[PDB]
From a paper:
N-Acetyl-d-neuraminic acid lyase (NanA; EC 4.1.3.3) is also known as sialic acid aldolase. NanA belongs to the class I aldolase family, which is characterized by a triosephosphate isomerase (TIM)-barrel fold and by aldol condensation that proceeds through the formation of a Schiff base intermediate between a conserved lysine residue and the substrate pyruvate. Here, we report 2.32 and 1.76 Å resolution structures of N-acetylneuraminate lyase from F. nucleatum in two forms: ligand-free and with ligand bound as a pyruvate Schiff base. Sequence alignment showed that FnNanA contains conserved catalytic sites (Lys161 and Tyr133) and the conserved specific substrate (Neu5Ac) binding motif GXXGE.
Author numbering:
A (entry chain A), D (entry chain A): 0 to 289
B (entry chain B), C (entry chain B): -1 to 137, 138A, 139 to 289
Write the structure that this text describes.
Amino acid sequence: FMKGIYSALMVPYNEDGSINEKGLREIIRYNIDKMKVDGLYVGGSTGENFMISTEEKKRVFEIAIDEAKDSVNLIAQVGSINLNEAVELGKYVTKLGYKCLSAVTPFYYKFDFSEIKDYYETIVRETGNYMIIYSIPFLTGVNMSLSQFGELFENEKIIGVKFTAGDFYLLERVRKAFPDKLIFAGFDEMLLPATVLGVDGAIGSTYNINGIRAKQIFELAKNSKIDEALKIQHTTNDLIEGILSNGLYQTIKEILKLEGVDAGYCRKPMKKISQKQIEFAKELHKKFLK
Amino acid sequence: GFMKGIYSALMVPYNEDGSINEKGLREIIRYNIDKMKVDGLYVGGSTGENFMISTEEKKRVFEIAIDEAKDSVNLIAQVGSINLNEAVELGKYVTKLGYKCLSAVTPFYYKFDFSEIKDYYETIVRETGNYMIIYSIPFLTGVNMSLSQFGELFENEKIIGVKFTAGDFYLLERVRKAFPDKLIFAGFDEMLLPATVLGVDGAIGSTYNINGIRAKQIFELAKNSKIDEALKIQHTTNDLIEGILSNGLYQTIKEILKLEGVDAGYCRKPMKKISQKQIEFAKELHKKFLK
Amino acid sequence: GFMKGIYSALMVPYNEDGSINEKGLREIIRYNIDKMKVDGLYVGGSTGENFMISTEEKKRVFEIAIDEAKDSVNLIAQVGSINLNEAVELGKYVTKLGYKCLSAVTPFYYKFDFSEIKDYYETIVRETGNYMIIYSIPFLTGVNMSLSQFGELFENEKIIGVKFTAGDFYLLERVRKAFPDKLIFAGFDEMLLPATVLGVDGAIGSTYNINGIRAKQIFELAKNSKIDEALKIQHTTNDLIEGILSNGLYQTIKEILKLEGVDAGYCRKPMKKISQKQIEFAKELHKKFLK
Amino acid sequence: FMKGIYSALMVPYNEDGSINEKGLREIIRYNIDKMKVDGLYVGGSTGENFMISTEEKKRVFEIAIDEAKDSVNLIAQVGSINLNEAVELGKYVTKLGYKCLSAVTPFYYKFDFSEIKDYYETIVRETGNYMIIYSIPFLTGVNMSLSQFGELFENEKIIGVKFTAGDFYLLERVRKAFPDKLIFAGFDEMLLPATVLGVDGAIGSTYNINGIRAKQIFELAKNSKIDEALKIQHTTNDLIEGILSNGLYQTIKEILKLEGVDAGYCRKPMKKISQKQIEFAKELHKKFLK
């Protein structure tokens, strides 16, 4: 029921570093109305979201839920810092109406798997909400074993997993071992291969600007029209190759400003986008998205 | 363009004393051609324990293979591995024997820069006059070549394709669009369905010695946009591969080939002999997936 | 130049409810200063589970540490981790409290290029006016900085040194010769003797909470060219460290500190509690190596 | 008794690719007389030695043993290809008089440890010679565990190990667990740190041209004169930094030609050394070695 394309909301910032509330609402509206996404992924690692305070993470969650209402599905990423920040955020967004959570493991310590399980099971026990897990524990690089997925999926309110690494063998194994769980692709350049292996959705940050093509790839592949889907994936990956060449986070923001959305400013010590990269973003915009 | 299809990576059987079992070799070729109905044979690949044999034992394998297969199937001769002079000597031997396509891994004895890899491949093409399939990863470096590096190699018209060994589907898709006129072979059997929908022209694998039927079906069904049926067969194939890998891939394939009446030969020291527990597991996999 | 010597990486003790155990914190400081006779304390480091605490809990730790240590030892305040605004806010807080040296890991939320790392460090130096020790590896990248990148950072005169976390002794030797006027700290206790003979000015480690005596001896004996005696103590130190690592380093250090009368506090969820088997093993190591 | 500095002999080649016999003798003489090395390491991975035939590997071993006689220790590396080539080479060099062997594991297969042990134990059983093992199985990157060293060192004719990776923690552990075995450093840039941890010798290819400084570092460190040894190591590493900057294999050969030794030609497809790199090798020669 949570299927479809999700855009990873990137939070825009004012000149002074605070959150640009009206700019945040404009990005939500652009994703819902123009990109016609099936959901929003709020609080993800995308861009520079993990640096903001707990207080500012809570204001972003409330602004998002009040502007999106339920035109779309919403998932709240509440992990990363530690387990009690995850629980406080998890019960705040549960009280705001967020019907699903996700959590990356904490960054301050390399936890064994038995502590990953306690971490995830505690967020489900203390919030009562649904949970999406990550196939890779935060900053470890190693995918979880298929046996470890089974131990986590024994909990019924852990309803899915977001794949960040493009291991399609493990993806296929998880897909067959757990036909009742949701699997989200977290790689936009390989959406077509993921869709034919039966993923239920995709979460990406390019879908802020390329959501239309992604919904077509997702829909055409689930109806076995591979010839047309591969051709759109070829065009999508020419956009992504240019965006990556040009700096992905800043190119997406610069393209959003070319579409009439105030995507805000960057926070130090990140270097400002150059004139050559602004002109290159406009060439990408006119070639692929206008 | 005629070299599309599923290829089996021939594994060389050995006698008790370590020499090659010529009649076991002929029976494996017949099994792949008649029962597996493969579209071609990949001879001389790194698969199993083939890189340990002498160049002269390599010449006898190439001659036995072309003489047992006739022209029922495509043949690709892997002539690299050791050095450039053995690659050229092997490359001209198998070209005179009738092989119409070559492949070559870079030599193992040195970490060559790209400008010396290109001279390596271009020299084998000039001295044999044969077609060439390159590897996306230089031997024992782990890093895929850049898309610009593919362009410099693909400037040669007798470098007709590339065998992908790492499952980087982003790079696979980029190479596919940048060079629509070149052949691309998947070298990963567990991900055949994803590679096929991105437009690979064939697959070279060692599981096709025993699972060639399912692989041909996945390849044909996916190229005809019937993903639902193709995904179910890929699921069954990966249940076999997961068991084969759990049990030791090289030895399980050999023991399964012996359960169907093919003399797969013996192992060479210092490789350990397969256990009774693994023979029984190979038999369960055989009865469950292939009988 | 006055900040040479052995430094202990303070591990913050926690109460049963997760808040910081202030009196346990004072007792750990006293144990390091009086019994271990360390030359300084490294406060706020990634060691153990310190990066999980709030900035406000970080401010109370910095204030407790400077007030318990007075000026018996050098103090370095690690103010990085979260972002640049917390680093600058922390950096000016501990500068007003009397800390004479800072260190900062790069932020964790983004993979910064080098030109943004340099702005990061130069901004903390300009906004606090304090001295700065950099890390040879940007937080969560794994790759050491280039020797040219060290030169661009060391152009700032208030960047007085570098803490090496990876044991690359070739790069350590190159940095040592290229910048004889800068401080270099080893951050690997198992290789103290090799780092000292290459001219490191000190060591920052977490084993020095309990093995500071042996580490000071290795440091002093090696800088006075008595390698034979220094190697024997390094052998004993590494027998302790091998046991500590086998048993879980963070929890074994805490349990050993409790065997000598220091309230090392409790663990925070989701970390698992130490077993009886590991408590008994910590006691054997204590009786064998430190009593 | 095998202590000291060993030079890794690099085989010079004629214009046609064959072995330059008189050039090989000249390199042996330069290492024995001018570099005053304590031994020669023949057949190692250095340069481009692993490509030559078994026949040409046998001629190199005999030329080396007949020109060096016993002015120096000799170790013969007989592994890499497969186990029966290792045994044939091992008994040939045992019949030539080589009193110690070494062997890297085969390249054609990723052997488990129980097959590494059978591999090494077979070369010792079939030749009766002494054996030096490598801490890293050929092309795997992973050091052996200290428990695995113990299982191998249970054989008394496996007398030592050559360390290729600079893990000084593992080096110190192996040194203490087996005080009766030889340990050779295989990293010239870190000779001083290795010497203070009690290594019995060093095997390197820079010792073809920098053997004098290396013997001084080795001798000064074993007599606790660290101040003088570190200063020579600083100078040695300035040479090595330049050699590496310039291409190590070709710079060493070009420096040997600047010292009056016919170090031969390169084999295709290796690119020939440039004029800028020849001039740079001469600057290194005049600055560090003349």
